[PDB]
Amino acid sequence: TVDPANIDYTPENASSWHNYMRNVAALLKTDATNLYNAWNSSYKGGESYASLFKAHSGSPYASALSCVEEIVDKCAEIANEVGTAKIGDPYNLYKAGNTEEALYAVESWYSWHSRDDYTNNIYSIRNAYYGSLDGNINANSLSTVIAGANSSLDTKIKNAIQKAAKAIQDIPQPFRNHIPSNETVAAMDACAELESILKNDLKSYIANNSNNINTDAVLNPVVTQYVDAVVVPTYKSLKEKNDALYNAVIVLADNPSNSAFETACDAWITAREPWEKSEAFLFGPVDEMGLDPNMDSWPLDQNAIVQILNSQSWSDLEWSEGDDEAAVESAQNVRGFHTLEFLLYKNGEPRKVQ
Ligand SMILES: [Cl-]
C-alpha cells in the first residue's frame, strides 16, 4: 500500500508544526552555511576547498585535467539522475501499472515544482560548461576551449543542453499528472542524448593528449573560473537564501496565516534555485559526511513526519533563548528541503490555515 501521509494544519497540531518547521529550517541553514564555508573559507580546518581545487597539487586532484574530468563526470551524473531516476522512475512505475506509486514518487510534486527543479538541474550543467551563471559563454570556459578546438563538438554539446532543458519544460505542468505523456518520453530522450554527449564525446576529446587542450596551461583558467564564478557564488546564494528561508519560517511560526504560508513558500522556491543549479557539482564537501542527503533526501518517511506533527513532545518543546541551532539532528528522510516542502505545500499550492 502507498502511504501518502495526508495531514492538514490545525489548531491542535499547530505547535508541533511550528516547532518541526523551525527544526528543519534550522538544519538547512546550518548545512548551507557549513557547505559555503567549506568552499570559501576553510575545509577541515585548512585552506578552503576552492583554494584546494584550483591548486590541484595532490591527490585526488593532481592536475587541471583531473579537475575537469571530475567537472564533466558530475555534469553527466546529474543528466543521468534527472533522466533515468527523477523522470524515469515514476515513468517506469506508471507504465508497469503501479500508477499511484508513480504519482507519489515524483520529486518536488508537493509544490508542482518538478519540471522547474529538473530544468534547473540541467541549467547547472549549462553553468558548468559556460563558466557563468547568467547564460553568458565566458572567455575562460570549457565551451570556449572546445569551440576553439572543435567547433562542431561545442555546438552539439550546447544544443544537447538546451534540448534537455526545453524537453523537461515541454512536459505538461505538472509532471506528476502527466507521467505517461509523450513529452515525458521526449524529456527522457533529450536527457539521454545530453548525458551521452557529455560523458562520451566531451570527456574523451579533452582526455586525448593529441588534441592539445588538457595541459594545466589550457585548463587552469577554466578550473579557476568555474570555482570562482560558478561554484562558490552558487553556494553563497544558497547560504543567503537558506538564511532568508529560516526567517520566513520563524515569522510563519510566530504569526501563522495564509499569507505567511505563501511567504514561506516563496522563500522555499527562492532557496531551491541555487540548490537545484548546484546539482551538476555534487562533489567535494556536499558529497561528504552525508551532507547531500541531510539537505535533500527524496523520498521521505512521510508517515514519520505525520507522527512528529501529531506528537506531544514536538508540541511541548521550548527553545533555548535566541538560539538558531536545531533542537534535533533529525534523520535524513525527515529533514531537508523536501520535508520543509511537505510542511509548506499541499497538492501544488501553499497550505492554508483552518
Ligand atoms: Cl510535479
Residue numbers in the entry: 31 to 384
From the reporting publication:
The functional site of PIBO is likely located at the domain interface and supported by the clustering of conserved residues, including the buried GxHxxE motif. As a result, our structural evidence clearly argues against PIBO being a metallopeptidase.
The second PIBO structure at higher resolution contains significantly more residues that display multiple conformations (57 for one monomer) than in crystal form 1 (45 for two monomers). The αO-αR insert (defined as the region between αO and αR) of PIBO adopts different conformations in the two crystal forms. The middle portion of helix αI (residues 215–231) in the second crystal of PIBO displays discrete structural heterogeneity and a helical shift. The two conformers differ by a main-chain shift, resulting in Cα displacements that vary between 0.6 Å and 1.5 Å. Thus, it appears that this region fluctuates between different sub-states, with its conformation affected by crystal packing or other external factors.
